[PDB]
C-alpha cells in the first residue's frame, strides 16, 4: 500500500461499486480510496495534488486526517474554511506531521462541503510495534481492513439534501435492487488463524448494524483506542467510527455472510444487499448459504473500557469540570442549530482569524458557532439528544482530540471511572444524554459537528477555540498554507 510519505492525486473518473455506472473521485487513480500506512512516531507527510475538473461533486477539496491530534499541526487538519481554505484544483498542498502518541485504525476524507460521499474517503493503519493486543491474532494487514459505505447513484448535489442509500459498499463492492448481480466483496481466512479485523465506517449518514454468520467477534479497539477485550456477536458501527475485532477462523471450511444492516434504506438482505462473503480458504467460488441467527450479544457502548481503565478526566460527579457546555440540538429553516445558532463557512478560515487578530468567541466568525476554552482545563460537554432535531441518532464528533464518554446512549449510569474512550459518539433517541469530558492539550481551532455529512452541510457544527492565546505560538504555518487563501479567492464560482 501507501504510506507514510506519498502523493495523494485525487480526481474524477467513472465507477461501478454496485454494477451502476457514474463519475465519482478517485484518488491516485483508484476507487475506493486507497490505504494509506506507517508506524507510531512516523512523520506523514501527505502531498495532496488536485486535479479533479468536475464542477458539480466540485473542482476544489481539502482532506481531514480522521482521529490525528495534529498538535502544533492545525493547520493541517483539514475543514475547510476552519483550518484552512480548500485546495484549488491545479495545485498541490503539503500535509506535514508526526503521530508521536497515537496508534490505531484511523480514516481520511475530503472535508469540503459534501465531497466525501462522492468518493474522496479512504482508510489509514498506523501500527504499533508494541501492541498489547499483539498476541490475540495471527493476521493484522491489507487484507483485514474492511470499510462500510454508502453509495448513491446520484451525486451528493444532484440528489435530496438528505438522500438515501441505493447500496452498502463492503471493501467498495454491494449490490442494489437493480443490480443484484454485480460482484460481492470476498474476505479470505485460513482455517486455524485468527484476524484483527479493522472496521471502518465510511459512511455519510447511515449506520450499520454489522455482523458474520457462525462468527463471534472480540472487540479490542474503538476508534483508535486500546480496549479490554469485549466478545459481541454483532457491532452498530455509527458514521466515522471505527471497531477493531479478532475473528478467530475455527469453523467448518465454508462461506459466511457478512452482513451489514444499514438503519435507512434498503434494510434487508434479499439478493445480497449489505451482505458480503466470508471465504475460507478452500471453499468453492459462490454466494454462501448461511442463515442469519439473531444476535444475543450485541456490542453496548456503555460495557467497554479502555484497556489501561483509565479514568474521566475531571472529578467524579456532574459539572466536576472547569467548563460544562450543554449542546442544545434544533432544527428550522431546513438549518440544523446548536443553541441558536446554524453553522455556515467563514469567508476567513478560523485558523486565519486567530493568527491575524481575534482574541476571543466573539471576536470570531460566524458568531454564536465558537466556544472558548481555557487551557489544561477539564471540558465536559453534553448532547441530549432530540426529536427537535431529524435524522437521529446523530454520531456526533470532535478533531484535535479522544474524549472519554462518560455517558452513552441507551443507558443512564454516568461512568467516571473507567469510560470508554473515543472520537465518534452516537448522541442517540430522543431520551438519552450522551456526556463526553476531556482535557484541554491542544492550542487550536477544532471542529465539532453532527458526521452525518448532509447534516453538517445544512449546520450542525460548532467550532471549539482551544487556549486562544496560544494558538498563534504552537501552530507554526507552511508559506503554501498561507498561499491557499489567496489563491482559493481568486477563483471563479465553477472552478471551485
Ligand atoms: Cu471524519
Ligand atoms: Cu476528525
Ligand atoms: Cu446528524
Ligand atoms: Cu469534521
Not at 476507487?31 to 458539480?56: A, Y
Not at 449490490?175 to 472496521?199: C, E, H, M, P, Q
Not at 444492516?261 to 434494510?267: C, D, F, H, V
Not at 440540538?329 to 485558523?351: D, K
Request: with cysteine; hydrophobic share 35%.
Amino acid at each position: 500500500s501507501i504510506g507514510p510519505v506519498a502523493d495523494l492525486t485525487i480526481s474524477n473518473g467513472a465507477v461501478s461499486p454496485d454494477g451502476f455506472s457514474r463519475q465519482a473521485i478517485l484518488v491516485n487513480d483508484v476507487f475506493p480510496s486507497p490505504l494509506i500506512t506507517g508506524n507510531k512516531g512516523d512523520r506523514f507527510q501527505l502531498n495532496v495534488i488536485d486535479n479533479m475538473t468536475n464542477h458539480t461533486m466540485l473542482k476544489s477539496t481539502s482532506i481531514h486526517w480522521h482521529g490525528f491530534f495534529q498538535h502544533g499541526t492545525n493547520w493541517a487538519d483539514g475543514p475547510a474554511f476552519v483550518n484552512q481554505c480548500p485546495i484549488s484544483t491545479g495545485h498541490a498542498f503539503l500535509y506535514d506531521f508526526q503521530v508521536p502518541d497515537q496508534a490505531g485504525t484511523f480514516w481520511y476524507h475530503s472535508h469540503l462541503s459534501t465531497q466525501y460521499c462522492d468518493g474522496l474517503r479512504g482508510p489509514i493503519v498506523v501500527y504499533d510495534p508494541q501492541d498489547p493486543h499483539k498476541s490475540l491474532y495471527d493476521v493484522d494487514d491489507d487484507s483485514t481492513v474492511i470499510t462500510l459505505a454508502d453509495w448513491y447513484h446520484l451525486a451528493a448535489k444532484v440528489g435530496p439534501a438528505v438522500p438515501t442509500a441505493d447500496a452498502t459498499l463492503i471493501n467498495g463492492l454491494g449490490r442494489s435492487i437493480d443490480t443484484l448481480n454485480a460482484d460481492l466483496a470476498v474476505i479470505t481466512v485460513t482455517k486455524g488463524k485468527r484476524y484483527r479485523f479493522r472496521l471502518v465506517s465510511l459512511s455519510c449518514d447511515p449506520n450499520h448494524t454489522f455482523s458474520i454468520d457462525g462468527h463471534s467477534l472480540t472487540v479490542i479497539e474503538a476508534d483508535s483506542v486500546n480496549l479490554k477485550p469485549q466478545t459481541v456477536d454483532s457491532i452498530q458501527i455509527f458514521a466515522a467510527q471505527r471497531y477493531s475485532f479478532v475473528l478467530n477462523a475455527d469453523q467448518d471450511v465454508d462461506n459466511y455472510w457478512i452482513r451489514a444492516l444499514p438503519n435507512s434504506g434498503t434494510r434487508n438482505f434479499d439478493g445480497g444487499v449489505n451482505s458480503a462473503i466470508l471465504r475460507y480458504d478452500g471453499a468453492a467460488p459462490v454466494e454462501p448459504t448461511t442463515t442469519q441467527t439473531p444476535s444475543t450479544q450485541p456490542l453496548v457502548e456503555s460495557a467497554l473500557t479502555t484497556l489501561e481503565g483509565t479514568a474521566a478526566p475531571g472529578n467524579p460527579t456532574p459539572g466536576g469540570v472547569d467548563l460544562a457546555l450543554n449542546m442544545a440540538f434544533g432544527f428550522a429553516g431546513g438549518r440544523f442549530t446548536i443553541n441558536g445558532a446554524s453553522f455556515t463557512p467563514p469567508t476567513v478560515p478560523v485558523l486565519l482569524q486567530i493568527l491575524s487578530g481575534a482574541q476571543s468567541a466573539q471576536d470570531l466568525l460566524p458568531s454564536g458557532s465558537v466556544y472558548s476554552l481555557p487551557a489544561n482545563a477539564d471540558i465536559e460537554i453534553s448532547l441530549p439528544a432530540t426529536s427537535a432535531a431529524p435524522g437521529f441518532p446523530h454520531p456526533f464528533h470532535l478533531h484535535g482530540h479522544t474524549f472519554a464518554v462518560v455517558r452513552s446512549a441507551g443507558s443512564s449510569t454516568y461512568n467516571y471511572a473507567n469510560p470508554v474512550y473515543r472520537d465518534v459518539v452516537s448522541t442517540g433517541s430522543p431520551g438519552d444524554n450522551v456526556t463526553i469530558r476531556f482535557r484541554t492539550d491542544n492550542p487550536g481551532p477544532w471542529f465539532l459537528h453532527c458526521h452525518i455529512d448532509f447534516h453538517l452541510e445544512a449546520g450542525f457544527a460548532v467550532v471549539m477555540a482551544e487556549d486562544i492565546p496560544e494558538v498563534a505560538a504552537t501552530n507554526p504555518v507552511p508559506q503554501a498554507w498561507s498561499d491557499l487563501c489567496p489563491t482559493y479567492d481568486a477563483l471563479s464560482p465553477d472552478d471551485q
